[PDB]
Write a protein that binds this ligand. Structure first.
Ligand SMILES: Cc1cc2nc3c(=O)[nH]c(=O)nc-3n(C[C@H](O)[C@H](O)[C@H](O)COP(=O)(O)OP(=O)(O)OC[C@H]3O[C@@H](n4cnc5c(N)ncnc54)[C@H](O)[C@@H]3O)c2cc1C
Length: 527
């Protein structure tokens, strides 16, 4: 019948499984996960496209729970999706997670009743549950956008959409002419895999992606995870506490070559402290990146499209993609880069893709690598309502805001790990997830001990958080990056939410104040 719970968790990714564990095992609550799709792992169950791979190195892209890490070993510094999914299998063997998940349970309505202090939640297939706490751990959905190109139904080959990548069987590209449309991380990853094996490979690029070198390595069979957890982003390092132009030119060059050789996010998060605050410092860094990247590319036309001497946006204002041998692919004669800023795609024929200049690029297989939605899309389809009955879509039509990235005014007893206005895209996920999950767990403990029936962020605390978020961003180069333009003007590009850029140590202090000052920023109601 109707399922009644202490807490209901939506999603079985890193976030929701951590919460299940803390709320069920540590707090001894009655808890279930409603999960939309077939199995655990979140984005790692959902996004199985070729090349899918982490961007944070072992051992950071993992839980810090000793029972989990005890017996696990990783085969390489930056594991792939299949190996992440096998880690989730390990988590389930250790923590016993699957038996408290209901799969194929896509939430499509939530409403809160102030008199009882409980949510009532419905799935698309008709499941219905009630719960005191609602933990919305939906991450970032895929962007399910198929551009209105003419002639797609005439195409004689096949079109795959990284919003629903097949599984069952790998798509073989041997002997095939292929196209990737899109240059976010998804596009970069698919293209690297496919450019290696396809008979011919076209990447359709509107803006260049400023990719950093991964430096992959094979690996072999507590205090350290604790000290890294104290950094800006939760990686092993943070910014170098010096201004760019306080170093001489030669010192800069040698410092940047060291970063670039270590690889991964060193160049982004171990760089000079004014990388993201001074446009000139930023441009000097960029000029380095371009020099190194262009040196890898033999054809001058390809070089200027992939790594222009003038930057397309301030480097580091977005989470950079990583790459292994992407730029080298283009030195093959059958590997092409098509500039769709200049010559947009205007159509598909039976044999290929047609650009505005009427050039036909013949292919057998097309991957649409639209990449991820803003955080907004996925949360708005939940059909959540505030206590006055208003949909979150309507609440947010004029801009989205939150308290701490984790609560929304008028949605009581509802918490959002790994979501907007939180350190999210500027941090290591799992470290933020555990931080928010621990906090949510402590906040629930506190309510249960104090007999608090509901807590709801106040419009004031929300507006104040939004003002801190904005103020931190205003001091950086973020207002000058091209994301905002694209979201406001360009069809298919969703409006992004600002991350909190204050760093995990400040973010922690803001969270702690809630627990130490009597639910500071929330209105409370008692049982
Ligand atoms: C290829 C790739 C590589 C990445 N590597 C890194 C990295 O190295 N470092 C890092 O910091 N981040 C990384 N990320 C970002 C990654 O999203 C997060 O690290 C993290 O996995 C998010 O976990 P989550 O559980 O919050 O969200 P998700 O993993 O997205 O899980 C959300 C869950 O909610 C479910 N869901 C959505 N809607 C509903 C609904 N209506 N009802 C029921 N369930 C629903 C989804 O099906 C899903 O199972 C990577 C992302 C990808 C795609």
């Amino acid at each position: 019948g109707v399922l009644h719970l202490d807490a209901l968790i939506i999603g079985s990714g890193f976030s929701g499984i951590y919460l299940l564990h803390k709320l069920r095992d540590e707090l001894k609550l009655k808890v279930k996960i409603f999960e939309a799709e077939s199995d655990i792992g979140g984005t790692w169950n959902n996004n199985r496209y070729p090349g899918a791979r982490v961007d944070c190195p072992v051992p950071f892209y993992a839980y810090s729970l000793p029972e989990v890490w005890q017996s696990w070993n990783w085969t390489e510094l930056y594991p792939n999706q299949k190996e992440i999914k096998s880690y989730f299998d390990h988590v389930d063997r250790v923590l016993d997670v699957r038996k408290d998940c209901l799969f194929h349970s896509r939430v499509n309505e939530g409403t809160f009743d102030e008199a009882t202090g409980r949510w009532t939640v419905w799935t698309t297939d008709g499941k219905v549950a009630t719960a005191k706490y609602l933990l919305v751990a939906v991450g970032f959905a895929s962007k399910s956008y198929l551009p209105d190109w003419k002639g797609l139904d005439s195409f004689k080959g096949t079109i795959y959409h990284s919003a629903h990548w097949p599984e069952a069987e790998e798509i073989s590209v041997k002997g095939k002419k292929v196209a990737v449309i899109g240059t976010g991380s998804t596009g970069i990853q698919i293209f690297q895999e496919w450019a290696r094996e396809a008979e011919e490979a076209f990447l359709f690029q509107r803006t260049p992606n400023l990719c950093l070198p991964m430096r992959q390595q094979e690996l072999h069979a507590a205090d350290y995870l604790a000290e890294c957890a104290l950094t800006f982003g939760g990686l092993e390092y943070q910014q170098t506490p010096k201004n760019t132009f306080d170093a001489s030119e030669e010192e800069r060059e040698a410092f940047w070559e060291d970063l670039y050789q270590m690889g991964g996010f060193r160049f982004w998060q171990n760089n000079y402290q004014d990388l993201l605050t001074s446009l000139d410092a930023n441009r000097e860094a960029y000029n380095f990146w371009a020099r190194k990247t262009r040196a890898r590319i033999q054809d001058p036309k390809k070089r200027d499209l992939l790594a222009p001497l003038e930057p397309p946006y301030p480097f580091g204002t977005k989470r950079p993609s990583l790459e292994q041998d992407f730029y080298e692919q283009f030195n093959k004669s059958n590997v092409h880069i098509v500039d769709t800023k200049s010559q947009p795609i205007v159509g598909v024929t039976p044999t290929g893709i047609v650009t505005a200049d009427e050039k036909v690029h013949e292919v057998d297989i097309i991957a649409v690598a639209t990449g991820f939605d803003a955080v907004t899309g996925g949360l708005l389809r939940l059909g959540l309502k505030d206590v006055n009955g208003v949909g979150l879509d309507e609440r947010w039509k004029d801009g989205m805001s939150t308290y701490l990235g984790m609560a929304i005014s008028g949605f009581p007893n509802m918490f959002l790990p790994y979501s907007l206005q939180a350190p999210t895209a500027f941090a290591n996920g799992p470290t933020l997830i555990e931080l928010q999950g621990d906090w949510i767990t402590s906040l629930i403990r506190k309510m249960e001990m104090e007999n608090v029936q509901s807590v709801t962020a106040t419009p004031h605390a929300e507006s104040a958080w939004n003002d801190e978020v904005n103020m931190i961003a205003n001091k950086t180069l973020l207002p000058l990056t091209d994301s905002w333009y694209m979201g406001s003007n360009i069809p298919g590009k969703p409006v992004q939410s600002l991350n909190y850029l204050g760093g995990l140590p400040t973010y922690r202090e803001r969270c702690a104040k809630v627990l130490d000052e009597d639910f500071f920023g929330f209105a409370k109601a008692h049982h």
